[PDB]
């Protein structure tokens, strides 16, 4: 999980979701998981 202030799509499989008041990026590539923070 990458925790950063700039969460962005890294590849075209990346999906930006909003989950319980936070921005996450979920993707089939585990390196691309992001949480804003």
Provide, rounded to whole angstroms, the least separation between the CB of residue 6 and RNA: 14
Q: Which does 21 bind (CB under 5 to 8 A by kind): RNA, Zn ion, Mg ion, none?
A: RNA
Interaction between residue 5 and RNA (CB under 7 A): no
Provide the minimum distance between the beta carbon of 12 and Zn ion in the complex, in angstroms, as a whole number.
7
Q: How many CB atoms lie within 10 A of CB 17?
A: 9
Residue 3 interacts with RNA (CB under 7 A)? yes
Cβ atoms of 1 and 33 closer than 8 Å = yes
CA atoms in the 13 A half-sphere facing the CB of 32: 15
């Amino acid at each position: 999980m990458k925790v950063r202030a700039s969460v962005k799509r890294i590849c075209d499989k990346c999906k930006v979701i909003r989950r319980h008041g936070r921005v996450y990026v979920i993707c089939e590539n585990p390196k691309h998981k992001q949480r804003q923070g």
